[PDB]
Paper text:
Here, we report the cryo-EM structures of a [name] nuclease (747 amino acids in length) in multiple functional states, revealing a stepwise process of DNA targeting involving a conformational switch in a REC2 domain insertion. These nucleases cleave the target and non-target strands using the HNH and RuvC endonuclease domains, respectively. Structural comparison of [name] with other Cas9 nucleases and the ancestral IscB reveals a common ribonucleoprotein core furnished with increasingly large protein regulatory domains, which were acquired during evolutionary specialization.
We resolved both the [name] binary complex and a partial ternary complex in which 6-bps of the R-loop are formed between the [name] and co-purified native nucleic acid (referred as the seed conformation) both at ~3.4 Å resolution. The PAM-interacting domain is also unresolved in the binary complex, suggesting that it is flexible, yet stabilized upon DNA binding. Based on the structures reported in this paper, we propose that this inactive state may be linked to the Rec2 domain in its downward-pointing “closed” conformation which requires a change to the open conformation to allow for R-loop propagation. Deletion of this region showed no decrease in DNA targeting activity in vivo but did result in a decrease in the number of colonies for both induced and uninduced samples, showing that deletion of this region increases the toxicity of [name] overexpression. One possible explanation for the increase in toxicity could be that this region may act as an inbuilt ‘brake’ and prevent toxic effects due to promiscuous DNA targeting.
Residue numbers in the entry: 43 to 186, 195 to 269, 548 to 655, 672 to 683
Write the structure that this text describes.
RNA sequence: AGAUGAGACGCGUUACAGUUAAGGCUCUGAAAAGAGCCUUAAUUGUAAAACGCCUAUACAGUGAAGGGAUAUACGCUUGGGUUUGUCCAGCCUGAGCCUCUAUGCCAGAAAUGGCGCCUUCAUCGUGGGUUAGGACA
């Protein structure tokens, strides 16, 4: 399964793009004349980390009659999109706000309007171009959404009625005004319910125009090295910080902080707990815990068990858990081991 | 009835540094208390998140000029980097080309124009691509 590979790819490329734009903003603000120790630079640079989300303002707008229409998978995916939008907007700002703090900071530093527009360009510049439209190349190009009229021609051609009302049905379905007329003939002649969902799927132009033939005949130890999340390794004790929700009920004794361990124990005692499985977020939130500003549940340092210094490698500041362990040490990771 | 692919916004982890709150230790002081160190949590700032391989004939920015459907490329053909002991997928890209495919944004009923986009020159720098997926050894 390559879905986790795609997720890691996206995180990697997003971090690289953020590196590129921070480097360009750093270079341009140095080229203006004020490098450091001037409060315009710290303000604008700290704004640049959290630049905002104007590109997808109100993403995937949809009406409730459409929410009642699609399949279970698509409506669960749309609920995921709605939850993603709600979760980001509590921590994301729209970019026109971030532009406003950039303007405030740069006006406070008596800069020119051309410099403000140039910083605006650096903030809005797209580095890796959105190249998405023609990506999947499932081909029968060797003969052995842009196909709308051909597709309804394939659907309607099996109806017993004569060709002229087939053309009128085609003209009714390609035009968005005449949908009630399609319901009129669709009540008039009783076909399968698969025919309604299919025909009104071309009427709503989902991704079905690419799964198609050529137009003339429409008629372990392999790749991964180590764990994703860095661990903390200081003076011989190995720990990693966990959120309270993420701590499983069977692992409460592993928390290094004693007082929060007792509070988690009486949290499991006060509320109904499931023995040894992961505990819920809002279920944990009602008990006595300090709240965070942004994500709204605290974090507690936890001890990692079962592994030790025999696998730990150090790439820059981070310390990871090696997945392959001994290959005799692995030659690719042989230079980064701790001992 | 299901799967490959692009671009960000965010969250989370780690390192360093600062601040606040709570706790512990030491010194000083007649005492109130003052100072310093350590632990936990919250908050802020900067940085890292494959190892590596390839690329300076490259990559990126700015300005000017020209083109922009008689056109470009996420396309085709043929090569290359990732690439190894060998072969792929995916991504990125050189040359030719418009045969298939794809062709964004804004104003305008439209014609059309302006942005995005492509090429050249000058200037400024060092930057860019791919790496968590497989199969045979």
């Amino acid at each position: 399964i390559l879905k986790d590979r795609r997720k890691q790819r996206g995180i990697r490329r997003t971090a690289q793009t953020k590196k590129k734009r921070l480097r360009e903003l750093k270079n341009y603000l140095k080229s203006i004349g004020y490098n450091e120790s001037t409060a315009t630079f710290e303000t604008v640079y700290s704004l640049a980390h959290k630049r905002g989300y104007d590109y997808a303002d109100m993403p995937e707008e949809k009406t409730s009659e459409e929410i009642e229409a699609m399949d279970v998978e698509e409506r669960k995916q749309w609920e995921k999109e709605k939850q993603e939008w709600e979760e980001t907007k509590r921590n994301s700002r729209h970019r026109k706000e971030v532009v406003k703090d950039v303007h405030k900071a740069m006006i406070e530093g008596r800069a020119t309007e051309e410099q403000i527009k140039r910083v605006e360009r650096i903030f809005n510049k797209q580095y890796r171009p959105k190249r998405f439209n023609n990506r999947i190349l499932t081909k029968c190009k060797v003969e052995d959404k842009n196909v709308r009229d051909l597709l309804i021609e394939n659907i309607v051609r099996f109806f017993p009625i004569e060709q002229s009302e087939k053309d009128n049905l085609k003209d009714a379905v390609l035009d968005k005004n005449r949908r009630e007329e399609v319901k009129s003939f669709f009540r008039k002649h009783k076909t399968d319910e698969h025919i309604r969902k299919q025909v009104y799927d071309i009427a709503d132009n989902k991704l079905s125009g690419r799964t198609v033939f050529c137009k003339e005949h429409i008629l372990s130890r392999g790749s991964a090295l180590h764990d994703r999340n860095p661990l903390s390794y200081k003076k011989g004790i190995i720990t990693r910080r966990f959120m309270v929700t993420e701590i499983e009920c069977g692992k409460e004794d592993d928390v290094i902080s004693e007082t929060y361990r007792e509070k988690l124990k009486e949290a499991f005692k006060r509320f109904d707990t499931k023995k040894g499985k992961c505990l819920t977020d809002k279920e944990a939130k009602e008990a006595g815990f300090c709240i965070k500003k942004n994500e709204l549940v605290m974090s507690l340092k936890c001890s990692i068990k079962g592994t030790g210094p025999g696998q730990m490698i150090r790439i820059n500041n981070n310390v990871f858990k090696t997945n392959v362990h001994n290959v005799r040490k692995n030659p690719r990771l042989s230079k980064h081991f701790i001992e």
